[PDB]
Motif scaffolding. Sequence first.
Motif, PDB file in Angstrom:
ATOM      1  N   UNK B 104     -17.395  34.499  -6.671  1.00 40.01           N
ATOM      2  CA  UNK B 104     -17.081  34.062  -5.984  1.00 40.01           C
ATOM      3  C   UNK B 104     -17.447  32.172  -4.835  1.00 40.01           C
ATOM      4  N   UNK B 108     -16.099  29.384  -4.271  1.00 36.61           N
ATOM      5  CA  UNK B 108     -15.804  28.503  -2.806  1.00 36.61           C
ATOM      6  C   UNK B 108     -16.395  27.264  -2.932  1.00 36.61           C
ATOM      7  N   UNK B 112     -10.018  27.150  -1.975  1.00 42.07           N
ATOM      8  CA  UNK B 112      -9.357  28.166  -1.166  1.00 42.07           C
ATOM      9  C   UNK B 112      -9.104  29.127  -2.024  1.00 42.07           C
TER      10      UNK B 112
ATOM     11  N   UNK C   6     -12.887  12.797  -1.363  1.00 38.18           N
ATOM     12  CA  UNK C   6     -13.098  14.577  -1.038  1.00 38.18           C
ATOM     13  C   UNK C   6     -11.703  14.860  -2.288  1.00 38.18           C
ATOM     14  N   UNK C   7     -12.548  15.834  -2.992  1.00 38.44           N
ATOM     15  CA  UNK C   7     -11.903  16.563  -4.167  1.00 38.44           C
ATOM     16  C   UNK C   7     -10.771  17.458  -3.417  1.00 38.44           C
ATOM     17  N   UNK C   8      -9.643  17.722  -3.738  1.00 35.76           N
ATOM     18  CA  UNK C   8      -8.701  18.632  -3.518  1.00 35.76           C
ATOM     19  C   UNK C   8      -7.516  18.658  -4.676  1.00 35.76           C
TER      20      UNK C   8
ATOM     21  N   UNK D  54       0.417  30.986   2.551  1.00 35.62           N
ATOM     22  CA  UNK D  54       0.943  29.096   2.269  1.00 35.62           C
ATOM     23  C   UNK D  54      -0.608  28.647   1.595  1.00 35.62           C
ATOM     24  N   UNK D  55      -0.602  28.422   0.299  1.00 37.58           N
ATOM     25  CA  UNK D  55      -2.098  27.715   0.120  1.00 37.58           C
ATOM     26  C   UNK D  55      -2.158  26.536  -0.114  1.00 37.58           C
ATOM     27  N   UNK D  56      -2.307  25.773  -0.819  1.00 39.19           N
ATOM     28  CA  UNK D  56      -3.673  23.952  -0.557  1.00 39.19           C
ATOM     29  C   UNK D  56      -2.137  23.160  -0.617  1.00 39.19           C
TER      30      UNK D  56
ATOM     31  N   UNK F  26      -1.955  32.292   7.464  1.00 36.54           N
ATOM     32  CA  UNK F  26      -2.539  30.497   6.783  1.00 36.54           C
ATOM     33  C   UNK F  26      -0.814  28.953   7.615  1.00 36.54           C
ATOM     34  N   UNK F  27      -1.254  28.010   8.260  1.00 34.25           N
ATOM     35  CA  UNK F  27      -0.690  27.474   8.611  1.00 34.25           C
ATOM     36  C   UNK F  27      -0.340  26.278   7.662  1.00 34.25           C
ATOM     37  N   UNK F  29      -4.327  23.894   5.337  1.00 30.08           N
ATOM     38  CA  UNK F  29      -4.976  24.486   4.835  1.00 30.08           C
ATOM     39  C   UNK F  29      -6.467  23.305   6.176  1.00 30.08           C
ATOM     40  N   UNK F  30      -8.057  24.031   5.608  1.00 32.39           N
ATOM     41  CA  UNK F  30      -8.781  23.255   6.233  1.00 32.39           C
ATOM     42  C   UNK F  30      -9.333  21.811   5.762  1.00 32.39           C
ATOM     43  N   UNK F  32     -10.617  18.390   3.643  1.00 32.83           N
ATOM     44  CA  UNK F  32     -11.553  18.149   3.218  1.00 32.83           C
ATOM     45  C   UNK F  32     -12.419  19.076   2.300  1.00 32.83           C
ATOM     46  N   UNK F  33     -13.692  19.134   2.928  1.00 30.63           N
ATOM     47  CA  UNK F  33     -14.073  20.379   2.386  1.00 30.63           C
ATOM     48  C   UNK F  33     -14.704  21.609   3.534  1.00 30.63           C
ATOM     49  N   UNK F  34     -13.574  21.722   3.977  1.00 33.15           N
ATOM     50  CA  UNK F  34     -14.381  22.722   5.249  1.00 33.15           C
ATOM     51  C   UNK F  34     -13.258  23.715   4.512  1.00 33.15           C
ATOM     52  N   UNK F  35     -14.344  25.144   4.851  1.00 33.22           N
ATOM     53  CA  UNK F  35     -14.158  26.569   4.006  1.00 33.22           C
ATOM     54  C   UNK F  35     -13.784  27.639   5.515  1.00 33.22           C
ATOM     55  N   UNK F  39     -15.799  33.050   4.345  1.00 34.30           N
ATOM     56  CA  UNK F  39     -15.942  32.731   3.336  1.00 34.30           C
ATOM     57  C   UNK F  39     -17.855  32.161   3.418  1.00 34.30           C
ATOM     58  N   UNK F  40     -17.963  31.134   4.093  1.00 32.65           N
ATOM     59  CA  UNK F  40     -18.735  30.533   4.322  1.00 32.65           C
ATOM     60  C   UNK F  40     -19.825  31.528   4.224  1.00 32.65           C
TER      61      UNK F  40
END
Lengths: 95, 114, 297, 126, 208, 134, 86
Positions: B104, B108, B112, C6-8, D54-56, F26-27, F29-30, F32-35, F39-40
């Motif tokens: 996990x 994380x 996502x 920022x990594x994506x 929907x994914x990234x 989910x429309x 994604x958050x 940057x590094x937002x989650x 999950x956080x």
Amino acid sequence: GVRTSPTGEKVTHTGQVYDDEDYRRVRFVGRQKEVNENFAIDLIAEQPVSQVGSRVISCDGGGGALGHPRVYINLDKETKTGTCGYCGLQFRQQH
Amino acid sequence: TSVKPIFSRDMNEAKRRVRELYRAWYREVPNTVHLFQLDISVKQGRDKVREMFKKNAHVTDPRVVDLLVIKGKMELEETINVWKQRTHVMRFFHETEAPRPKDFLSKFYVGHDP
Amino acid sequence: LHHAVIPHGKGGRSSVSGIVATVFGATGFLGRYLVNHLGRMGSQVIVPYRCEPYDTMHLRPMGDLGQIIFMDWNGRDKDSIRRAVEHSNVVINLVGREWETKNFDFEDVFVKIPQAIAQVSKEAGVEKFIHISHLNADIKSSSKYLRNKAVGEKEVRETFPEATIIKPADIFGREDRFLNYFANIRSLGKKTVKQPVYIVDVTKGIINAIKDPDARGKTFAFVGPNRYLLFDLVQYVFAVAHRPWTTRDKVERIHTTDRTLPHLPGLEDLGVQATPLELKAIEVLRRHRTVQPAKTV
Amino acid sequence: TQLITVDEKLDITTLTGVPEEHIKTRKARIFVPARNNMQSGVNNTKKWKMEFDTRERWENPLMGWASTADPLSNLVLTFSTKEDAIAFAEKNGWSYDVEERKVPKPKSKSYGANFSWNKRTRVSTK
Amino acid sequence: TRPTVRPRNDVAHKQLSAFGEYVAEILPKYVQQVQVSCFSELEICIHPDGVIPVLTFLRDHSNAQFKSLADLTAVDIPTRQNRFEIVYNLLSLRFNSRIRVKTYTDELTPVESSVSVYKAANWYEREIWDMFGVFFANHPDLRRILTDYGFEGHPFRKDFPLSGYVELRYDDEVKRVVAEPVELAQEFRKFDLNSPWEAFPAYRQPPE
Amino acid sequence: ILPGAAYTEKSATYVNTEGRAQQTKVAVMPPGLAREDWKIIRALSEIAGMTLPYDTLDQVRNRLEEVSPNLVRYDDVEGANYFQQASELSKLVNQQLLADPLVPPQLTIKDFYMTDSISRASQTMAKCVKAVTE
Amino acid sequence: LGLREIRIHLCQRSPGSQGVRDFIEKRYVELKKANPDLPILIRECSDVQPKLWARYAFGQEKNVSLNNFSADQVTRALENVLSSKA
Ligand SMILES: NC(=O)C1=CN([C@@H]2O[C@H](COP(=O)(O)OP(=O)(O)OC[C@H]3O[C@@H](n4cnc5c(N)ncnc54)[C@H](OP(=O)(O)O)[C@@H]3O)[C@@H](O)[C@H]2O)C=CC1
Ligand SMILES: [Zn+2]
């Protein structure tokens, strides 16, 4: 009507310029950032407002079928001109 | 629930066909390592065959394992008759693919995906 | 941290790894596989090249569009170095020659150019700097290679105090000059002990040293899992390759034993399993064909 | 006889070639799509659709395009009934959730109610 | 309705209706539906146990002589429990006519191969194996014909994505073309184009 | 600061004022590094050595069903009985009514446009406020 | 270490929840007057089997099925929960 960022980079007519800490300026190292130096927002402001004697004017952009679709502009507001939504030319009732 | 069979009337004939396909792949692995001049061992190739057979080991439908044996026979015919190149044999070994995050916390950390 | 870095993605070719890497000496043996492993993550790779642009063509399929930026540089030009490193968040040095030339000796290649790269990378604000020395680097070494490389390691450490310095022992691979040297010599057998390391292990160690924030300022030693005598290693090379350009400095280096440095971290401390020679020597020496393994000490 | 009796659950997941990441971590959504409230037409609300979570989507570093890594990001399927969609998702091993069809309830309309003698439903203008 | 409208051919409609009745009553064991389109194309929708007896009839009967197999086709329709619709387009050079013979299968029921009737089918249904996963029983050499050699998945199934699941690239480490999971630098942009208004009232389905 | 997901950026259960449970999808994604938020919290639990017994969104919703099963029956209003028992419990402690008049915190359209952190960051809502205050 | 909350799940209409309903109509109020600082969350739902959740200290939760009980059996299960505190 191009200006320049403090990084030395030309701001495009959209307003795009990379930040100083943005790595994507490295694509222009040894090369050039191609901008167009004829800004359409600066050129359509240079046109004279057409003084017409009617209340509703029609614009097609000129050239007949070589322009835009023919729209009709109302000129009842004496505060503000009537601008064509396609070509940006603007019209004023002469009274 | 009365369906038309492909080859197997039940699961025992199906396991017979799975077993004969596994025998043919097990015999084929040293020849495949040799003539495609692979960088893997014969034991590692037989491990990949065993992994691909155990991947489907939960199926209880005779028609589904009949199609799995048919597709395994097709891949075997593409391997014996040299129709695959080296690259198609080595696609079972996902070597240039970096290993995915499994727990996990690393999923994380990277993004996502659940 | 800037938003564009920022990594994506899922770590593939079209992804963003957040690594902007200036890899000096990327047209060599290590730079080939380092740019291949960087560009497969979706990393911005600046390749400063000295050579003919034709000789850089093999670096172009290694990433997505715009992800490898080729630019000219000279080793004695700090302005080209600043022109190459000023957008990067990591600078890797791989500049090396096995032999000295008329215009570049071992001191220019190993002392002057790495100190120039590390000084400019310090005064450009680059976060991470990776330098590649040799495991056998010593001031009191008999070869000029190892002397100038120890001097250059010391100067890199003193002018970039957070530099990750990496010691590979003897890197073997398809384009090496270790197994391909012994397979094309067809110089003698002495008491030299070596543990060669595989190039993909070295490349995974370099990328793990990029990704680890704990690797700043460390000095790693990349060695293989098996130590060999020089004689039975050469006999294993001739046995696998189905066989019955040099200088005296290369001879002094082949007859220099690979030292054991247990106080330095290695490939296990970066999460790298060192691949033995017995898996990869057939892959290297399959080119040289027109075997009982070598004894380890 | 020439007909066998397979009393097992229909499962074709080993035959579709879909990798495991896109079978067991995907949530299929089975739904009748809502009427676009910019418009009064209802012909897009006649069928059941299947889509996925929907994914990234991220920004291409070169052009700013929408880069994706989800293969199923455009996969929209059309079904005549709800049970066909449920059976197709169960056959493929997709974990699904179903939203029931929202019909508009029958309104009571009367043009004469615009001009009532004593009710609040008089129109002030027409 | 003269200039811009297609002229209707009533003679061919009556003749193909008569021949559709003819085939439906000669072969009631397998014929399920018979229909003629408004542009005069006859479709015989049959049971899949009658692939060989119907096609052997139309090929060999002296009032049919459909000697040519024009095209053999599958269609994925995922809302049906028999999602695959196998289509046999046939040509009679003697009577200058075309017929369509349609049947069905799901993922697991094999269709009998028609290579004994038409040898032309030898590749076509082979392609139906490659593109749809429909197995054909007693095919001489049934294998893939269009996809790559290690290709998993049957692409013309409508649950198969447009870009696949893998993409190739050359990798210089392994000195080899490799397959990786597909990442697009630009996603294919799905356009929702369908109008919310009914276009053809003659095709209105009865509501629930 | 732990950067989280907004309502357009997560599949997420919200229960309205009538008790109906509903879920967003989910429309996008958050950024940057937002989650995603749980999950956080779940990753924080794994760092702390008190790892919570869920890994996926469905397992969180199983836990959520265990605490009250109405939170997973979507587009459903579960009827709540027992007004009499709550009214009997309310008769126990006699709290005194204040002399202050009942004034709602939003009297005009001015007060409507900015209530939460998304509306306060909204330039459109700022233009609505500046348009109704002039 | 001690009981922290109580959760009682039940149905509005199912007969297997009926005794649980018979518990809440009659015996909840003097329960809540006996335990003013103990949260006893009554949760009705559509088709659930009855259930008594007992959250204890440090996240411990015990789980009692109240299906087909009488109100006396619900009273005894709940007072065993109150007296345990383990
Ligand atoms: N087995 C090994 O190879 C080992 C290597 N190392 C070290 O690793 C590094 C990389 O090794 P390797 O790939 O084998 O070396 P190579 O000889 O294959 O390539 C070195 C690179 O440095 C560049 N370079 C060399 N001299 C100069 C110069 N004067 N100015 C500018 N660029 C220059 C070359 O560019 P161009 O193509 O233009 O000539 C080439 O791209 C070196 O520093 C080496 O000392 C350490 C341990 C073992
Ligand atoms: Zn105009």
